[PDB]
Amino acid sequence: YGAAVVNIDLNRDFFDTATGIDLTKGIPLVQDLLVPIGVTAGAEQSAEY
Amino acid sequence: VGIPKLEVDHISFSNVVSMMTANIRTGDDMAVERVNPDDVRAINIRNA
């Protein structure tokens, strides 16, 4: 009695945080698979989606 | 009427044109900044 919001997403258990994936935001974010070759330092932070 | 000061063949003492200031210093100079185009590979060369 007092639940503000419920929802559905990716299970933070089958997709463990240790290997392969991470979920702090709604988007399942891994680190380095497709990094833009020739850009600035602040870029490629979206290509990890 | 009035022959020019040259081609007449005599020395004389006439007038000039001047100004007041140091003229070359204003305390400044053209101060421009240049924003870099972001990254390479996406720059357009094909304008012919």
Q: Which two tokens stand for residue B32?
A: 């421009």
CB pair distance less than 8 Å for B38 and A37 = no
In angstroms, rounded to a whole number, what is the distance separating the alpha carbons of residues A9 and A21?
14
By the CB < 8 Å criterion, does A38 face chain B?
yes
Give me the resolution in angstroms, 1 decimal: 4.1
Give B-chain residues touching A37 at CB under 8 angstroms.
Answer: 41
Q: Which two tokens stand for residue B48?
A: 């012919």
In angstroms, rounded to a whole number, what is the distance separating the alpha carbons of residues B20 and B38?
48
CA A31 centroid distance within chain: 9
Which position has the token pair 């012919």? B48
Which position has the token pair 């003229």? B23
Residue of A nearest to B42 (CA): A38
By the CB < 8 Å criterion, does A39 face chain B?
yes
**Cα dist from A33 to A21, B24, B45, whole Å:** 12, 58, 29
Most A-contacting residue of B36, B39, B43 (CB-CB within 10 A), to test interface? B39
